[PDB]
């Protein structure tokens, strides 16, 4: 028997927890137990690795020994990039930004998460599907989608089909995406460049029939955005929160961007060359704030990691929450230094197998870049145009993590004024 967690006697052992504060059940975990420690997920064991050698075997596995497949039921009821184009993005996500703030005016007031959850919607539809398709969507798509996100919790490792309410608004707003892009497809018939929906709807079946149908073509978009979308609009609100929160940094940020738009270049050519600054402020801002707090693996067979036995069929996790700050790779852990990023300390380049908020490994993001890039185009157009301050205690902002997918908590309320 491999050490279990202290607590867990509730009905589904340690599941209850893990849907009120999973990152203090995690850290409690390593806490009691090091590198190799499990918990209980109602039917299910947890492995949770952590430290750079724990982590090293976790990443460096292959689909033959540790599967993503199965690992994330919560999923199924849901769904049903190149440099050479990386430039064309930024200039789409400057134009996303711009149009989301062309009725901000001199002065108001914007919630973080409802702000960057609509752009995120539109920089990554816009980007991944079309422009043309981006500009039949409005704020009622973000609406579905934040629903889709909300319907994760981690009951669904009890089963996905629970009769709770978040299922059912999950489910209802899968429906009702369906039914927008019906609306979409339909409008394109009656009113006459193309992206990849005029690609899907062109498809014939053996028969003669259109092969893909609204269903099967909404699945695919909501699969499409749904790596970057919770991810890329919980660290634009993180990193506006934290640059909030140390003025210093704020105020270098600012500094440097002015200097470097100083020669006439474009958002487009800027996003994709060094912002040395913010990017260390990002950097800083995926440690503390990972947008994914565990990730998840099916064992396909036996391994030993440090003494301890993992059998097959076992859940095996690692968790960014708790690794990127373990005291022994990150001096003063819970401090926000992005001066740990500069040549050097380069704790995230010094850490390979610790400072994870993108993964490693075989399982690289490959999607950091494009990430990385929509940050650096996002705050290139919002910091120099308007100014923020924060309308609420700085330590009140916080993430609610009763849900798989961590989203911002309300409020998050933040005030702008032009420069
Ligand atoms: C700030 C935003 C993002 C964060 C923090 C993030 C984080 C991660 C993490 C932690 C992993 C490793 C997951 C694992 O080992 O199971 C990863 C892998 C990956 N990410 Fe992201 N990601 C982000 C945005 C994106 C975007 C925009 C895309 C889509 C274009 C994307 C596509 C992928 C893919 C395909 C993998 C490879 C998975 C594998 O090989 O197992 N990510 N990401
Ligand atoms: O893995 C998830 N999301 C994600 C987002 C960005 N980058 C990597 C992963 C997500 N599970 S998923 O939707 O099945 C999924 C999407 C894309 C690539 C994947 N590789 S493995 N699973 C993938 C998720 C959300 C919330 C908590 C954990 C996992």
């Not at 391994?303 to 929450?321: C, K, M, N, T, Y």
């Not at 022994?328 to 230094?337: I, M, T």
Request: hydrophobic share 40%; proline share 5%; glycine share 8%.
């Amino acid at each position: 028997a491999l050490p279990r967690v202290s607590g867990g006697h509730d009905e589904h052992g340690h599941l209850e927890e893990f849907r009120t504060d999973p990152i203090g059940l995690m850290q409690r975990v390593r806490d009691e137990l090091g590198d190799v420690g499990t918990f209980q997920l109602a039917g299910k064991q947890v492995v949770l690795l952590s430290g750079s050698h724990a982590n090293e075997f976790f990443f460096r596995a292959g689909d033959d020994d540790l599967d993503q497949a199965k690992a994330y039921p919560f999923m199924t009821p849901i769904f049903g990039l190149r440099g050479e184009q990386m430039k064309g993005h930024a200039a789409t996500i400057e134009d996303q930004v711009r149009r989301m703030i062309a009725d901000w005016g001199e002065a108001g007031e914007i919630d973080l998460l409802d702000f960057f959850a609509e752009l995120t919607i539109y920089t990554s539809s816009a980007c991944l599907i079309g422009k043309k398709f981006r500009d039949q969507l409005d704020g009622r798509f973000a609406k579905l989608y934040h629903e889709l996100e909300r319907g994760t919790d981690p009951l669904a490792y009890v089963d996905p089909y629970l009769p709770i309410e978040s299922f059912r608004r999950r489910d209802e707003a899968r429906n009702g995406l369906v039914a927008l892009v019906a609306d979409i497809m339909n409008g394109r018939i009656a009113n006459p460049d193309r992206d990849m929906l005029d690609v899907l709807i062109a498809v014939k079946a053996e028969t003669g029939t259109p092969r893909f149908s609204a269903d099967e073509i909404t699945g695919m978009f909501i699969s499409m955005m749904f790596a970057g979308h919770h991810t890329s609009s919980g660290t634009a609100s993180w990193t506006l929160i934290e640059l909030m929160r140390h003025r210093d940094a704020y105020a270098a940020v600012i500094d440097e961007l002015d200097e470097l738009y100083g020669d006439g270049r474009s958002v487009s050519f800027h996003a994709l060359r060094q912002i040395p600054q913010l990017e260390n402020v990002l950097k800083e801002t995926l440690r503390l704030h990972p947008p994914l707090i565990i990730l998840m693996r099916v064992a396909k067979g036996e391994f030993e990691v440090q003494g301890h036995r993992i059998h097959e069929g076992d859940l095996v996790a690692a968790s960014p929450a708790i690794s990127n700050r373990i005291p022994e790779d990150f001096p003063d852990p819970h401090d926000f230094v992005p001066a740990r990023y500069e040549q050097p300390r380069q704790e995230d380049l010094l850490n390979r197998w610790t400072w994870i908020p993108f993964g490693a490994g075989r399982h690289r993001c490959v999607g950091a870049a494009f990430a990385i890039m929509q940050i650096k185009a996002i705050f290139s157009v919002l910091l120099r145009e308007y100014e923020f301050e924060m309308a609420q205690p700085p330590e009140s902002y916080r993430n609610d993590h009763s849900k798989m997918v961590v989203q911002l908590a309300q409020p998050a309320a933040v005030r702008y004024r032009r420069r």
